[PDB]
Each structure stands twice: as C-alpha cells, then as structure tokens.
Curated annotation (Swiss-Prot), chain D:
Note: Variant D614G has become the most prevalent circulating sequence in the global pandemic since April 2020. The mutation is associated with higher viral loads produced in cell culture and animal models. It would not change pathogenicity nor neutralization properties vs vaccination. May be prevalent because the mutation increases virus transmission in human population.
Family: Belongs to the betacoronaviruses spike protein family.
Modifications made to the protein after synthesis: The cytoplasmic Cys-rich domain is palmitoylated. Palmitoylated spike proteins drive the formation of localized ordered cholesterol and sphingo-lipid-rich lipid nanodomains in the early Golgi, where viral budding occurs. Specific enzymatic cleavages in vivo yield mature proteins. The precursor is processed into S1 and S2 by host furin or unknown proteases to yield the mature S1 and S2 proteins. Processing between S2 and S2' occurs either by host CTSL in endosomes, or by host TMPRSS2 at the cell surface. Both cleavages are necessary for the protein to be fusion competent. Cell surface activation allows the virus to enter the cell despite inhibition of the endosomal pathway by hydroxychloroquine. The polybasic furin cleavage site is absent in SARS-CoV S.
Protein's cellular compartments: Virion membrane; Host endoplasmic reticulum-Golgi intermediate compartment membrane; Host cell membrane
Outcome of substituting residue 92 to V: In strain: 19B/501Y
Superkingdom of origin organism: Viruses
UniProt comment concerning the protein's domains: Contains sequence and structural motifs very similar to those of a bacterial superantigen and can directly bind and activate T-cell receptors. Activation of a broad T-cell repertoire may be involved in the hyperinflammatory syndrome in acute COVID disease.
S-S bonds: 61-88, 101-110, 170-176
UniProt name for this protein: Spike glycoprotein
Effect of substituting residue 112 to A: No effect on O-glycosylation by host GALNT1
Region (Disordered): 65-79
Biotechnology: Main component of the anti-COVID vaccine Chadox1/AZD1222/AstraZeneca; in which the human tPA leader sequence is added in N-terminus to enhance protein secretion.
Length: 49, 97, 146, 181, 49
C-alpha cells in the first residue's frame, strides 16, 4: 500500500555498488599493458626489493 | 541474515597487486615515458639525473654523489617499514571507514 | 514523506553536479586558456591545446596532444672525458650509433656534433661511473689557425 | 553450545534465536536461515540474440534446483554449472581464454557473447603483456610523432524544477490545507 | 524509517568516498606517472618520484 518506496532504496544501493567498482577502476587501471622488471637488479646501487 | 548481502568486488586483490606491479616496473624501467606513449627504456641513474634537472639542480651533482644518494635512498626506504609498523594509528584512515 | 525523499535525493544529486561543474571550470581555465603541464589532466600525451564545444547540459573538450611514434635503440654515456675533464650536455643526452657520438634532444632524434657550446665542463673525469672517452670540438680554434 | 541447565534459548545479536532446546528430549539444536539471494540475468542486447544466463548471487547451488509455472530451475542443465565467488552461473560455458571485460559478474569473472555464438564465462585479462629491454647503457628516443585529438565530456547543469507543496499534497482542497498547516 | 535513514547516510558516505577516490586517481596520474611542480602535492620537499 506504500507504492514504490522499496524500489528506490534498492536502486540507490545498486548505484552505490556500481560506483565502488568505478572508483577502483579509475584509480588503478591507468596502464594499458603489463610491464615486468628484468631479472637483473643492476640499478646503479638502488635497491627496490 | 535478515536480507543483508555483501557483494564481492569486481577486481580481486591479486589483480590490484598486478596493476601496481606493472606501474612500478614501468616507472623503474622507462621513467615517465610510458605514461605519455610507448615505453622507452633509460638507465635509472640517467632518469634520476633528469629528475634532478627537473627540480632545478644540475645533473653532474648526482653523478658526483651517486653512491651517497643511493645509500640515502636505501636507508630511507628501509625506515618506512618500521615507521608504519610501530605506530598503530598510521593506517587509521582505512580503519575508520 | 514522498516529497521529503524527493528533495533529499535532489540535494545529493545537485552536490554531485556542482563537483562536476567545478572540474569543468578548472579544465576550461587550464587547458583552453593556457598550456597545461599536469600529466593526464588535458588528455593522453603531451598537451598542446584544447577547444571547447557546447553540448546540452554539458561541455565537450577536444584535446590536441603530441605522441611519439617510432623509436630506435642507441647506447649512452653519462659524460665524456676529453682532456682529463668530464663533459655533460647542457640540454639533451649523449647518444651513439655504433661508431660516433652525438647530442640529441630527449624527445626527438636530432644528432649534433659534440662541441663546447653543447656541453659544460664540471670537475674531473675520475668520479663519474661509466664515463666514455672521445673528442670535443672548439670552433674558435680552427678559425684562429686559419 | 554448552547450555546451562536453567537456559532455554540462545541469542548472539539479541534479535535472532540462533539456538533452542527441544522440549521433550532435552537436546540443543541450532537454527539457521534456509537460503536467500538475488537473481541476476546476464544478457546481450535484443539486437544480438535472445539467449540469457542467470546468476544466483552468493549461494551454494547444489541448492539452486529446489529454490523456487515458471519453474525453469536449472534453466539449461546441459550448460555446465560452476560455482564462482559471486554464486554459480547457469547458462554459460567456461573458457580458459582471457579477454577484456564487457559484462562484469564479480570476483574477476566476466561474461560475453561471442562465437555458433553463445554466452561464455572467463577470467578478465588485465592487458597485453610487455617487457622493456632494460640495460644500463641503452636508450630509446623517438624518430617521429603523431598528432591526436581526444574528446572529454562533462555535465555542467541540471534541470531547474520547482514543486508546490500544497498543490501536490492538498490540491484544490481547503480542509486538507487546514489539516496540513 | 530505519531503512530510509540507513540509505541516506550510506549515500552521503559514498559521496565522500568518491571525492577521496578522485583525489587518489589525480595523485596517481600526476605524482607517479610524472614529476609535479605543485607545492606539497606529492609530499614535503622537492618532488622526485
Ligand atoms: C636489497 O636489500 C635487502 C634488504 O631489504 C637485502 O637483503 C638482505 O641481504 C643480507 C645479505 O644478503 C641479509 O643479511 C639481510 O637479512 C637481508 N635483509 C632482508 C630484509 O631480507 C638484499 O641483499 C639487497 N639486495 C642487493 C642487490 O643489494
Ligand atoms: C654514425 O653516424 C656517423 C655520422 O653521420 C656516420 O659517419 C658518416 O658516415 C657517412 C656515410 O653515410 C660518411 O659519408 C661520413 O663521411 C661519415 N662521417 C664521419 C665524420 O666519418 C657513421 O657512418 C654512422 N655509423 C653507422 C653504423 O651508421
Ligand atoms: C680514454 O683515453 C685515455 C688516454 O689518454 C685513457 O687513460 C688511460 O687510463 C689507463 C687506465 O687507468 C691508464 O693506465 C693510462 O695512464 C691512461 N692514459 C693516460 C695518458 O694517462 C682512458 O682510460 C680512456 N678511457 C677509457 C674509459 O678507457
Ligand atoms: C613520420 O610519420 C609520418 C606518418 O604520420 C610519415 O608521413 C607519411 O609518409 C609516407 C611515405 O614516407 C606517405 O606515403 C604518407 O602519406 C605520409 N603520411 C602523411 C600523413 O603525410 C613520415 O614520412 C614519417 N617521417 C619519417 C622521417 O619517417
Ligand atoms: C632494442 O634492443 C632490444 C634488446 O633485447 C630488442 O629487444 C629491441 O627489439 C631493440 N629495439 C630496436 C628498435 O631495435
Ligand atoms: C653496465 O653493466 C655491465 C655489466 O653488464 C658492466 O660491465 C658495466 O660496467 C656497467 N656500466 C655502468 C655504467 O654501470
Ligand atoms: C513423551 O515423549 C516421548 C519421546 O520423548 C514420546 O515417545 C511419547 O509419545 C511422549 N508421550 C506422549 C504421551 O505422547
Ligand atoms: C539494433 O537492431 C537493429 C535491427 O537490425 C539494428 O538495425 C540496429 O543497428 C541495432 N543497434 C546497434 C547499436 O547496432
Ligand atoms: C557447498 O559448496 C562447496 C564448494 O564451494 C562444497 O564443497 C559443499 O559440499 C557444498 N555444500 C553442500 C551442502 O552441498
Ligand atoms: C583450462 O586448461 C586446463 C589445463 O591446462 C584444464 O585443466 C581446465 O579444465 C581448462 N579450463 C577451461 C575452462 O577450459
């Protein structure tokens, strides 16, 4: 008898849920290829271990 | 259990780690070139000399003091583990959320 | 209750739209009215210029950028030792095609003869690690001899 | 749970009776909710086809065939059902090949419609692999360039809407407005 | 009423989290993929990397 009070709540929660994945994607997926360091650590004395 | 569910994130933790490892490898092996376009390799001391020129210090300063700079960087990167482990409130921003 | 729910949701959405409009104003100020040095702020690549374009309830930016295309392998040297003195390039990088050495700018291949106006002398060549070992030219001397 | 002799129920969150004691045989048996979850339909556009896949979110799906005439239950039993961290997917085929995601599912699993053509499920690929030929005396400098133009779209303004309170609540009525004041 | 209160507070918190994620994405683009001249944007001192 209250109409569509329930649908809006679920819609808002789903919007938040989608926004979270958008946030993670926009922060971390900034590179289009996957790069790997060479097996040799000749960095002129700089230790990145 | 009263109608409450938690949904898994689309990207797993291993995928985030792979993304960060790719970013780190690109930064180490190519400087800032992999962000503008194709990645171009450059020796790390020469990249550091470019950064020194960027902050307004001539590049022979780094070549004359390369060992000292490397040692200072290694010590500084070593200290941060203890710095963040010793203080419980270092990672408070995530704990609050 | 229905009216209150509608008003609250409208307030939240208006806050989001205001954040977007502030970002758009910043982009108009920095990408269109000038040339921006911030990375990835005005498009992918090295920013050159931008052009605005009006759209219904929004704006569109066309970002003109510079992208390097074709690269080649070379060998480098941090410095050059000529007469016991170490030479560093004023602006550029020492590069070799296998037999000779040149100075080029970093973002585009343009080899030049290593002279005293391309490089500066700083200190002695006993401290630099990996220094390479060549001849530099002073254009004044050949003119004086002639 | 070690019940004390004078105790009858068990409550951990203070609104749910997680345990109870049988009246006749004095034995203690815990109570758990049967099962529930959301039902999502993975579908390409009614352009491409009419085949669909169904995901039962966050459930062990040995239980799916007997959950809840529209009794598809296991919609396509031939389509190998398999558990993911989001649930189990029914109507899609598992594939080893990895591609860029287009229809996200969850926990790194993505679904797509491709060639004959059917809905497939796979782990998303983060991008093409690459390795920079790093050495301590090698440089790469470009010998050419390209000029590129890219578009960026930003919303600026909303629609200016005004709503009258009395007209919406108590339209053309005096008793309603007197009660509303 | 309880559900509506929960949803409203969740929306406000999600907006704040989105602002934080936008800042993080900007920092990843500027401090990590380049070298920034903005003062105190990438730590105290002259930014190197
Ligand atoms: C880079 O630094 C790590 C330390 O973080 C070095 O690992 C140490 O190695 C020595 C001897 O090889 C050990 O006694 C230490 O216990 C190690 N420390 C840790 C934390 O594992 C590593 O050897 C360094 N690598 C280079 C190439 O210098
Ligand atoms: C590296 O570049 C130098 C400079 O151009 C080349 O030396 C010249 O080569 C041309 C042949 O194309 C001759 O006509 C010139 O007389 C050379 N100049 C000098 C000063 O000797 C050299 O051949 C190049 N090496 C390689 C392997 O490409
Ligand atoms: C560049 O040329 C000079 C030649 O003058 C080289 O200098 C010699 O270095 C060796 C090794 O220490 C000494 O034994 C000689 O006495 C040096 N020569 C003179 C005249 O003092 C120099 O080694 C060359 N550079 C490189 C990197 O090989
Ligand atoms: C740099 O790249 C451009 C392509 O963008 C080259 O221009 C092309 O050159 C070929 C033949 O050399 C022509 O058939 C094309 O019509 C050209 N394209 C355009 C858009 O004009 C250019 O030659 C390259 N420069 C160098 C030095 O390699
Ligand atoms: C540069 O050298 C590396 C050495 O492994 C090679 O893989 C790469 O293809 C070379 N690039 C060019 C343009 O010759
Ligand atoms: C580069 O590495 C090689 C070993 O692969 C070494 O012989 C050489 O001295 C190094 N050069 C510099 C400048 O570090
Ligand atoms: C009393 O309980 C036992 C089992 O606990 C049951 O078999 C029996 O029928 C019960 N008594 C009556 C009168 O039903
Ligand atoms: C959707 O279907 C119609 C029917 O053939 C087609 O003409 C239309 O182009 C399709 N939409 C897209 C985006 O391709
Ligand atoms: C629930 O699923 C797991 C696998 O995730 C399986 O080992 C277990 O047997 C299942 N439980 C039941 C009651 O079928
Ligand atoms: C992928 O290949 C492995 C063998 O390397 C096999 O065990 C597995 O079943 C395959 N999975 C799919 C979905 O093809």
């Amino acid at each position: 008898q209250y109409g569509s009070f329930c649908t809006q709540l679920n819609r808002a929660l789903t919007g938040i849920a989608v926004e979270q994945d958008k946030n993670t994607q926009e922060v971390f997926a900034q590179v289009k290829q996957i790069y790997k360091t060479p097996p040799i650590k000749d960095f002129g004395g700089f230790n990145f271990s | 259990f009263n109608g409450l569910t938690v949904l898994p994130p689309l990207l797993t933790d291993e995928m985030i780690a792979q993304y960060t490892s790719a970013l780190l490898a690109g930064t180490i092996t190519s400087g800032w070139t992999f962000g503008a376009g194709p990645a171009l390799q450059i020796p790390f001391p020469m990249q550091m000399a470019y950064r020194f020129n960027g902050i307004g210090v001539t590049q022979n300063v780094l070549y004359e003091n390369q060992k000292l700079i490397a040692n200072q960087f290694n010590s500084a990167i070593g200290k941060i583990q203890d710095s963040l482990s010793s203080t419980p409130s270092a990672l408070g921003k995530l704990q609050d959320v | 209750q229905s009216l209150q729910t509608y008003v609250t949701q409208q307030l939240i959405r208006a806050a989001e739209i205001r954040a977007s409009a502030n970002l758009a104003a910043t982009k108009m100020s920095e990408c269109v009215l000038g040339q921006s040095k911030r990375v990835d702020f005005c498009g992918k690549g090295y920013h050159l210029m931008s052009f605005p374009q009006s759209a219904p309830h929004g704006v569109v930016f066309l970002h003109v950028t510079y992208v390097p295309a074709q690269e080649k392998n070379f060998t480098t040297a941090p410095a050059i030792c000529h007469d016991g003195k170490a030479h560093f390039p004023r602006e550029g990088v020492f590069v070799s095609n296998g037999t000779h050495w040149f100075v080029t700018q970093r973002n585009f291949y343009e080899p030049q003869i290593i002279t005293t106006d391309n490089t500066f002398v700083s200190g002695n060549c006993d401290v630099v690690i990996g220094i390479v070992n060549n001849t530099v030219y002073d254009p004044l001397q050949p003119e004086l001899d002639s | 749970k070690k019940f004390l002799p004078f105790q009858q129920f068990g409550r951990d969150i203070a609104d749910t009776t997680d345990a109870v004691r049988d009246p006749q045989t004095l034995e203690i048996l815990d109570i758990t909710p049967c099962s529930f979850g959301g039902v999502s339909v993975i579908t390409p556009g009614t352009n491409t086809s009419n085949q669909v896949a169904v995901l039962y979110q966050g459930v062990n799906c040995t239980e799916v065939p007997v959950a809840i005439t529209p009794t598809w239950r296991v919609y396509s039993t031939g389509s190998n059902v398999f558990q993911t961290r989001a649930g189990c997917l029914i109507g899609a085929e598992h594939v080893n090949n990895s591609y860029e995601c287009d229809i996200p599912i969850g926990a790194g699993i993505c679904a797509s419609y491709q060639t004959s053509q059917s809905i497939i499920a796979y782990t998303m690929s983060l991008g093409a692999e690459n390795s920079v030929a790093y050495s301590n005396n090698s440089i790469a400098i470009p010998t050419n360039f390209t000029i590129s133009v890219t578009t960026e779209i930003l919303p600026v303004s909303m629609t200016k809407t005004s709503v009258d309170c009395t007209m919406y609540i108590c339209g053309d009525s005096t008793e309603c407005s007197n009660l509303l004041l």
